[PDB]
Amino acid sequence: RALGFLYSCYGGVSTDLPSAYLGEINSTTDEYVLPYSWNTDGYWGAYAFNTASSTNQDWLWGTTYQYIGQCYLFLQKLENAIASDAEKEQWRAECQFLVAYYHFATLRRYGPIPITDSYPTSEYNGRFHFDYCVDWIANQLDEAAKVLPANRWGRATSTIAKAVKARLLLYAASPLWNGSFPYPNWQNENFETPGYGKALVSNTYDKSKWERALAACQEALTLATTSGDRELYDDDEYYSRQSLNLPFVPGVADVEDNKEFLKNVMKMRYAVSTRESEGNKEIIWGLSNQFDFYSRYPLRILKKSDGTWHAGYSGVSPTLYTFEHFYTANGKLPEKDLDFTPSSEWFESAGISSREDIIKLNVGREPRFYAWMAFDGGDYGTKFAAGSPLKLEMRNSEMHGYNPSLFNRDHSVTGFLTQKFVDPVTEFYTAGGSTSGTSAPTILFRLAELYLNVAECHAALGNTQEAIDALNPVRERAGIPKLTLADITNNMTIKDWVHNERFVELWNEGHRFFDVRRWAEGAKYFGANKREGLNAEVQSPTFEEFNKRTTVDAPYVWENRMYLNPVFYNEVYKNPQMVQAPGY
Ligand SMILES: [Ca+2]
């Protein structure tokens, strides 16, 4: 009975699930767009188009605080009763972690929040100052970490607790919360935070926040890679064990000299789509909860024997920003790489026989690019179409292109697709039915992020070589060159490198939403007309008219109120100590 209640306390951790295509943390960034006509599904549209409001929103807050309540209730049921002292202590530590985590999941969306330290309206807490919240949550995580095991329904570990504290302190040190908050006059009305009066957010840069984040990110990384038994996924032969062909990559043929590159492509596909039982020791916190794959599949996949088609929805549509910020094979940005095609020629055909639709921008790229992206003329998957890779025809309205007559008008907005998280063994059958190979946990925390977090902290503190040394394990694993001091220039700073490595490595893992926000760069990356793609919403285009830089045509905008999630109007009314977020 007790375990059942305990298990139920974990029920809210799938809130804001990474990679779920209708979720606003996933489908509102510059990573990829969804068809405008899909805006009637879910909340992504409201958030991307700034129509979310106090009366139109994802009331995430209702869920987190409900499960926080369950945690405290469990602790009470325990006190009134079963299990050893040691086991009861573990249960209490799991609840402590969960309460802290639920506050963090709320904080990262809403900003300053009520701290609920236990289960009349005048006694209601309003928001506490952001820095108060950070301190309280961090302490709670440290306390739970003392008790929890470093390694083991994925139950809490000290490793996870320290990883959450690391990300929390990284966020707290970031511009939004450490000197660049765009509403300096926003404060409480008649609620006070101990030590902060009515203030809600710091308006002054504090270097010590970066020193504290570095210490936490370092401690999390060491714990994960020692007692936590974590290491970067580096198996490069699983494709062979599953009897799969090496993938087709334009410009990198399957020849002896290119075997390492092609194996790195498959390693990256498996890195984010495998279980610990399959040899993956990189995941720190993963959930059983799955997310939809059909939204990223191409339209027509395979014609069945009865004459109907296996079909995807083809809606997850990577931007030109994504296709321009994954690296070249030399580990540089395409625009900055002196050996790469000049941008004036990016949209020309690469001239590959039988695959003339492949443009030059898509040749000469890093293994992560071919692992996770897909494009006109290229392959999608490995066993996808009854045992063979699927060749994409993004300009053919009778295969993978835009077609206004298709039910629901599913299509790629940009002319590109992603295959990240797609199991290489995924296969659709002529006789009907299909397989997606072996499911994998949805990643909340994995070890690559801890390296990137340490790099960002070093960069902020001016420790250039140390930042480089934290990035290079991730770069090497992905099969691009290591960084050296010679690579750090006015044109491409250590911070530029850290932010871009994060963009690439953690692409579509629910980070970009938060990172652009904490960097206070909403206008720069999420603003009107920033999102671009090919000319992909014209039926049956020529190669020439298809491959033109085209602004994504939907009401995307950035205004500063969008840094924070608005509070449900009823919560603002129900709680007299509660203030609405700025601009809402
Ligand atoms: Ca798998």
CA 376 to CA 393: how far, in whole Å? 6
Resolution (A): 1.8
Sign of CA dihedral 104, 105, 111, 116: negative
Q: Alpha carbon of 403 to those of 299, 308, 407: distances in Å?
A: 10, 17, 9
β-strands 373-375, 416-418 pairing: antiparallel
Alpha carbon distance 103, 68 (integer Å)? 8
Q: Is 54 annotated as a binding residue?
A: no
Distance 248 CA to ligand 1 centre (A): 20
354 is in an annotated binding site: no
The pair of three-digit structure tokens given for residue 416, joined into one six-digit string: 């590109």
Distance from residue 440's CA to the centre of ligand 1 (Å): 5
Distance in Å, CA 274 to ligand 1 centroid: 4
| Separation of CA 438 and ligand 1 centre (Å) | 4
271 alpha carbon – ligand 1 mean position (Å) = 9
Q: Which of 552, 556, 529, 508 is nearest to 48 (CA)?
A: 556
CB atoms within 10 A of CB 441: 19
CA atoms within 13 Å, Cβ hemisphere of 4: 1
Cα separation, 140 vs 92, whole angstroms: 12
CA 326 to chain centre: 15
- Closest Cα to residue 112, out of 133, 84, 93? 133
- Report how this structure was experimentally obtained: X-ray
Q: What is residue 347's three-state secondary structure? A: coil
The reply to whether 438 sits in an annotated binding site is yes
Cα-to-centroid distance, 450 and ligand 1 (Å)? 23
CB atoms within 10 A of CB 345: 10
Instruction: Give CA–CA dist 161/98, Å, rounded.
Output: 9
Tokens of 499: 């932010």
* Strand order across the beta sheet in which 434-435 lies: 388-391, 379-385, 427-428, 434-435
Dihedral (C-alpha) 471, 473, 478, 484: value to the nearest 10 degrees? 50
Write out the DSSP string of 368-425: HHHHHEEETTSEEEEEEETTEEEEP-TT-TTTTS--TTSGGG---SSSEEE-TT--TT
Q: What whole-number distance in Å separates Cα of residue 75 and Cα of residue 67?
A: 13
8 labeled part of a ligand binding site = no
DSSP secondary structure string for all residues of 453-501: HHHHHHHHHT-HHHHHHHHHHHHHHTTSPPP-GGG--SSS-HHHHHHHH
Q: What is the CA(214)–ligand 1 centre distance, in A? A: 34
CA of 314 to the centre of ligand 1 (A): 20
Q: Are 235 and 267 in contact (CB under 8 A)?
A: yes
Nearest to 315 by CA among 292, 331, 335: 292
Determine the distance separating the centroid of ligand 1 and the alpha carbon of 258, expressed in angstroms.
25
